[PDB]
């Protein structure tokens, strides 16, 4: 078995190897990358996502989200308070303000310490989940707006044609902006490219150990657990590395820098935070190996998780028994 300790692997494809996306994902899996739940891909030196980022300030963040925490430093939830629209140029100025900027620090580890110590005492503002792409249309390799669609993968694998579309999302972050512990919708893969700015630190649980994280989460968030049998689908709970270590939960961590891709694998729980002003782009995707994870994915039916139009068909075809109850939660 390749990568039996489930370490995060880092890949350096050549420009030749960067041509065929599906093939390279299958290669990474042949080396055991999926066992970690997360892999880093450093693009060939010849590759670029676009020529410059000089003209992005007029992108609109229609609903910036203020991430307000409740709990204790290592075990907290966050809720998202909607704020007034602002441009990316306005948001970048805000991120660089004295109130919101990254503090002085020695290195990523020092910054990570300061994050866990201090996050809950602040409410950073996240420009998340903005439909769109920063890849130049002429970028042919690993262009997240030109991937094969999950609907087409389900059709190729299973023969059933379904409605729905699959497009990327932009994320504009600042210091302390936070992504809560989650897997993807329908336990899909994700791919995330850090276009610009300051780093993003990731934490990940190997897929084979995801249920250990779920059991800890039920213990640590007991009211939430009673409310919903899949409450991590709400994407609100945070648990620190120290707490995970105290409770024996297997995990790994890595920092992504600008110019790097990360891939999350089916049922790889992940969480993290941004170091300062940045912009990332991410999208879900599928491979043949995903289908069995899709069929087994938990679902929130309490009404909180509320997701895209396109998840309907995935539930309806892969999980017909659950369909009725899950759709009640959607309506």
Ligand X SMILES: O=C(O)CNC(=O)C(=O)O
Binding residues: 126, 182, 184, 192, 200, 228, 234-235, 270, 300, 302
Q: Which of 100, 175, 179, 193 binds ligand X (CB under 6 A)?
A: 179
**Closer CB to Zn ion, 89 or 303, in the complex:** 303
Does the protein bind ligand X through residue 24 (CB under 6 A)? Answer: no
Binding residues for 2-oxoglutarate: 126, 192, 200, 235
**Closer CB to ligand X, 11 or 323, in the complex:** 11
Instruction: Report what 302 binds from Zn ion, ligand X, Mg ion, none; CB cut-off 5-8 Å by kind.
Output: Zn ion
**Closer CB to ligand X, 307 or 323, in the complex:** 307
**Closer CB to ligand X, 199 or 329, in the complex:** 199
Rounded Cα gap, residues 320 and 119, in angstroms: 41
Binding residues for Zn(2+): 228, 234, 300, 302
Rounded Cα gap, residues 253 and 202, in angstroms: 6
Does the protein bind Mg ion through residue 331 (CB under 5 A)? Answer: no
Per-residue contact flags (x/-) with Ni ion for residues 171 to 200, judged by CB under 5 A: -------------------x----------
Please say whether the dihedral angle defined by the alpha carbons of residues 168, 176, 200 and 36, taken in this order, is positive or negative.
Answer: negative
Does the protein bind ligand X through residue 150 (CB under 6 A)? Answer: no
Q: How far is the CB of 110 from Zn ion (least distance, A)?
A: 37
Instruction: Report what 171 binds from Ni ion, Mg ion, ligand X, none; CB cut-off 5-8 Å by kind.
Output: ligand X
Q: Which of 300, 311, 315, 318 binds Zn ion (CB under 5 A)?
A: 300
Does the protein bind Zn ion through residue 228 (CB under 5 A)? Answer: yes
**Closer CB to ligand X, 289 or 316, in the complex:** 289
Does the protein bind ligand X through residue 41 (CB under 6 A)? Answer: no
Does the protein bind ligand X through residue 192 (CB under 6 A)? Answer: yes
Which residues in the 256-275 window bind ligand X by CB under 6 A?
264, 270
- Contacting residues for 87 by C-beta, under 8 A, at least 6 apart: 57, 58, 59, 60, 61
Q: How far is the CB of 101 from Mg ion (least distance, A)?
A: 23
Does the protein bind ligand X through residue 61 (CB under 6 A)? Answer: no
**Cβ contact 220:77 at 8 Å:** no
**Cβ contact 47:140 at 8 Å:** no
Does the protein bind Mg ion through residue 46 (CB under 5 A)? Answer: no
HEC-encoded secondary structure of the chain: CCCCCCCCEEECCCCCCCCCHHHHHHHHHHCCHHHHCEEEECCCCCCCCCCCCCCCCCCEECCCEEEEEEEECCEEEEEEEECCCEEHHHHHHHHCCCCCCCCCCCCHHHHHHHHHHHHHHCCCEEEEEEECCCCCCCCCCCCCCCCCCHHHHHHHHHCCCCCCCCCCEEEEECCCCEEEEECCHHHCEEEEEEEEECCEEEEEECHHHHHHHHHHHHHHCHHHHHHCCCHHHHCCEEECHHHHHHCCCCCEEEEECCCCEEEECCCCEEEEEECCCEEEEEEEECCCCHHHHHHHCCCCCCCCCCCCCCHHHHHHHHCHHHHHHHHHHHC
Residues that contact Zn ion, how many (by CB under 5 A)? 4
Q: Which of 46, 58, 163, 331 binds Mg ion (CB under 5 A)?
A: 58
**Closer CB to Mg ion, 59 or 68, in the complex:** 59
Q: How far is the CB of 329 from Zn ion (least distance, A)?
A: 7
Q: Residue numbers of the site for ligand X (CB under 6 A)?
A: 171, 179, 190, 192, 264, 270, 280, 282
Q: Residue numbers of the site for Mg ion (CB under 5 A)?
A: 56, 58-59
């Amino acid at each position: 078995a390749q990568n039996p300790n489930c370490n995060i692997m880092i890949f350096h494809p050549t420009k030749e190897e960067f041509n065929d996306f599906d093939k390279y994902i299958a290669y990474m899996e042949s080396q055991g990358a999926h066992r970690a739940g997360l892999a880093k891909i450093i693009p060939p030196k010849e590759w670029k996502a676009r020529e410059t980022y000089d003209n992005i300030s007029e992108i609109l963040i229609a609903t910036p989200l203020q991430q307000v925490a409740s709990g204790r430093a290592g075990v907290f939830t966050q809720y998202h308070k909607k704020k007034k629209a602002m441009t990316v140029g306005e948001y970048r100025h805000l991120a660089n303000s004295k109130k919101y900027q990254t503090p002085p620090h020695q290195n990523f580890e020092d910054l990570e310490r300061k994050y866990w110590k201090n996050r809950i005492y602040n409410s950073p503002i996240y420009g998340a989940d903005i439909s769109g792409s920063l890849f130049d249309e002429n970028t042919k390799q690993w262009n997240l707006g030109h991937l094969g669609t999950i609907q087409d993968l389900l059709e190729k694998e299973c023969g059933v044609v379904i409605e729905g579309v699959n497009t990327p999302y932009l994320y504009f972050g600042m210091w302390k902006t936070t992504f809560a512990w989650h897997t993807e919708d329908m336990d899909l893969y994700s791919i995330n490219y850090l276009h610009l700015g300051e780093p993003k630190t990731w934490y990940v649980v190997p897929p084979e150990h995801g249920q250990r994280l779920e059991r800890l989460a039920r213990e640590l968030f007991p009211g939430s657990s009673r409310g919903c049998g899949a409450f991590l689908r709400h994407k609100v709970a945070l648990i620190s590395p120290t707490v995970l270590k105290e409770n024996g939960i297997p995990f790994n961590r890595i920092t992504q820098e600008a110019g790097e891709f990360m891939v999350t694998f089916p049922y790889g729980y992940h969480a993290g935070f941004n170091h300062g002003f940045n912009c990332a782009e991410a999208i879900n995707f599928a491979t043949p190996r995903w289908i069995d994870y899709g069929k087994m994915a938990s679902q929130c039916s309490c009404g909180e998780a509320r997701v895209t139009f396109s998840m309907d068909a995935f539930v309806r075809i892969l999980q017909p028994e659950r369909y009725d109850l899950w759709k009640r939660g959607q309506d």
